[PDB]
Design a protein around this ligand. Structure first.
Ligand SMILES: Cc1c2c(c(O)c3c(O)cccc13)C(=O)[C@]1(O)C(=O)C(C(N)=O)=C(O)[C@@H](N(C)C)[C@@H]1C2
Ligand SMILES: Cc1c2c(c(O)c3c(O)cccc13)C(=O)[C@]1(O)C(=O)C(C(N)=O)=C(O)[C@@H](N(C)C)[C@@H]1C2
Ligand SMILES: [Mg+2]
Ligand SMILES: [Mg+2]
Lengths: 173, 173
């Protein structure tokens, strides 16, 4: 794995300088006797990607009380907030692929949706599509804010698009 | 506005170095007697954002032969390809807001969907949501590729999520 004290420090610096200004040399200048090394920046951002979810993605895993709508909705809501908790959250996540630990739990997501009446390809599609929508929505929210140096709510807009998405999936539950 | 020879040169350099390596000083080192200036990088990326669409967003505007499904579908397909034509296309677009010229044509999109049976808030939601989904989908495609230094198709995956999206909107045409 890799130490928490180090990850916390990188997250906090990320809030200061965003992804573009975040480097491992600057990470060390923040910290200065337990050893750490990242294979490269991308590796740092993969770790932060994972950390963001560990800390905030709270209806990631299913629960007896869930039904399919309530899980995907909550799941999307919860993903989104993990992305929004940190500067450049969405950008960082892009192109990441869920890990070995994230795989076991990501297999639970499926075996629930199949349980509930979706086909295999439909279930992958429900997760990806929600995923693509969310990253998209957050990216636009985060950049619009981030770029302001040069109407009714990004939460509404998200919440709506997600409502539409859940309907079109219901057409094959 | 701002000169085409200059924009072409910036697009071509963008393909070489992505957004992170693109700066106005490097743009000039590419060119070196007609004058140009960008207020800042963000302004450069706003112009490139617009150029990408001017060049490739081909079922942006409606047409008598369109119906609503075929327009939103095509529209999304066409947007997406504009984003994919250039490195970091999606990232660049994030946070941009369609211009004065893009406004007149963006008003045509609506007055078509309202024409076809969507309410006002539904029509905004259809465009945004497709928009958020697309930027999301492309961002993940572009980064996954971009980051490779450290199953069945991103076109399928997009095409599917877009299919689901169009269904959930049909629930209020
Ligand atoms: C299934 C899947 C997912 C994600 C993902 O990136 C991904 C991928 O890049 C390739 C193949 C499959 C997936 C998510 O990012 C993620 O957000 C995620 O990792 C995830 C998670 N770790 O809990 C989720 O809950 C999912 N939710 C947004 C639908 C989604 C699931
Ligand atoms: C309506 C709207 C749109 C976009 C957009 O960014 C935006 C916004 O940032 C704030 C408020 C409204 C909009 C698009 O990016 C854009 O891609 C776009 O500019 C656009 C265009 N210029 O033709 C489109 O066709 C749209 N399509 C993806 C649904 C969508 C329309
Ligand atoms: Mg991911
Ligand atoms: Mg835009």
């Amino acid at each position: 794995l890799q130490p928490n004290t180090v990850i916390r420090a990188a997250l906090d610096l990320l809030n200061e300088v965003g992804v573009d200004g975040l480097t491992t040399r600057k990470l060390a200048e923040r910290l200065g006797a337990l050893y750490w090394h990242f294979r490269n920046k991308r590796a740092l951002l993969d770790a932060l990607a994972e950390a963001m979810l560990a800390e905030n993605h709270s209806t990631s895993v299913p629960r007896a009380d869930d039904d399919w709508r309530s899980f995907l909705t909550g799941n999307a809501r919860s993903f989104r907030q993990a992305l929004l908790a940190y500067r450049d959250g969405a950008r960082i996540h892009a192109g990441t692929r869920p890990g070995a630990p994230q795989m076991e739990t990501a297999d639970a997501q499926l075996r629930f949706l199949c349980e509930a009446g979706f086909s295999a390809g439909d279930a992958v599609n429900a997760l990806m599509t929600i995923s693509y929508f969310t990253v998209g929505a957050v990216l636009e929210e985060q950049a619009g804010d981030s770029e302001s140096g040069e109407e009714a709510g990004p939460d509404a807009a998200f919440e709506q698009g997600l409502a539409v998405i859940v309907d079109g999936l219901a057409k094959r539950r």
